[PDB]
């Protein structure tokens, strides 16, 4: 499984020029043109640079590609927040009857972005689920930055860890993050406590929402 070598990550501050390298061999990059692709979370890659440092319609000229011997580079000048994505290079390899090689990808972070506190919405089990002899509490966490939270649940005021499942944070369209956490209970447990809470900690501060069966 051949791969062109890219650094796993790259970063810069808005306005800066950031470069991402791509290293291959004589039979691929050494002999052939390197293209670049941008992949924003949740979407297919899109062609960014091809041929003689050429840009498809819609790609600004602050994206430029270069190549020398067996390595290539993508320079992004005038760095902006919407540039956050994974970037891949690719080149044809003439050897072994011919095949495409892609890079391993580089995740680009624009640093110095403003922190944003998470919005938390907590739902109790539905009557319909309880009547099916199950109970799930649903904690939805959105619009936070940077993209790291910790979630803790409480039965009354005390910690509960059993039955908790939480997603990794995922980038939203606005480059903020979202996550969700679920607490599975028996209907007996749900009914036997005064309340349950989901507490989300982000950058040293917490937001906690509470639901009660009697409500």
């Amino acid at each position: 499984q051949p791969v062109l070598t890219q650094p796993p990550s790259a970063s810069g501050t808005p306005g800066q020029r950031v470069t991402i390298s791509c290293s291959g061999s004589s039979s691929n990059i050494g002999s052939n043109t390197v293209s670049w692709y941008q992949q924003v979370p949740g979407t297919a890659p899109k062609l960014l640079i091809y041929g003689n440092n050429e840009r498809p319609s819609g790609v600004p000229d602050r994206f430029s590609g270069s190549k020398s011997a067996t390595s290539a580079s993508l320079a992004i000048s005038g760095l902006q927040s919407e540039d956050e994505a994974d970037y891949y290079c690719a080149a044809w390899d003439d050897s072994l009857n011919g095949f495409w090689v892609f890079g391993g990808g580089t995740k680009l972070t624009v640093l110095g972005q403003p922190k944003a506190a998470p919005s938390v919405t907590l739902f109790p089990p539905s009557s319909e689920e309880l009547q099916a002899n199950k109970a799930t509490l649903v904690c939805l966490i959105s619009d936070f930055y940077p993209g790291a939270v910790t979630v803790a649940w409480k039965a009354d005021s005390s910690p509960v860890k059993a039955g908790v499942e939480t997603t990794t944070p995922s980038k939203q369209s606005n480059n903020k993050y979202a996550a969700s956490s679920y607490l599975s209970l028996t209907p007996e447990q749900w009914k036997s406590h005064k309340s349950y809470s989901c507490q989300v900690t982000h950058e040293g501060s917490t937001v906690e929402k509470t639901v009660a069966p009697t409500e």
């Binding site: 297919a44 091809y50 690719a90 109790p124 939805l140 939480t166 997603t167 996550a179 639901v211």
Partner: protein, 226 residues
Amino acid sequence: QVQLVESGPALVKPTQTLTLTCSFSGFSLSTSGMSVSWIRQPPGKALEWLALIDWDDDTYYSSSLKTRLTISKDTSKSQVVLTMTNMDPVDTATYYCARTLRVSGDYVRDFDLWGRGTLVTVSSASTKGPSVFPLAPSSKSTSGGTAALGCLVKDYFPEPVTVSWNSGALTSGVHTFPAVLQSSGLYSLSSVVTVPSSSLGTQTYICNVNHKPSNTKVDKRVEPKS
């Protein structure tokens, strides 16, 4: 106007063969300088090119995976088909088809347009359709003029599930969250929409859940809590 649309099974058992189809429109594969490739991407990992077929019926294959692959095209149906034998859990991935285009007097545009991709999961576990529950807005849970309501899509396999609201009429304020993979090996996800608090009394809200891998669709009415 150019479309590449991948299709195929969402779930394949280990050792079985996977057949994917790319149905394209807006261009002809018989046109000089056109080609179509399959490229896959395991979740959270890099793109990996698999095979290409060009306007002259020439084929190229991944040098490392060649013995497992076949690519062919059907001019009559505007389809390109990939076959991959002896599937393994490491082959679980999104499979994309992508077009390549040479414009006369210009360098080739490799992989200039990509389909949305189709997720293939390789597993011995059986398909399971979701149980859909409403998440009704509470009176203590409003945010002033707006309220959030939603639907919980519980315990399905494999991915993906998609969700719309009111048959696509309600798009403002919709947020469908990525699924959680439970320790049980099943997935769950939630979708929420934010609407005017005052509307809860007069508007009907319905989440439309689609789980193509189980050929199931559920339209779940989310009633005000009472």
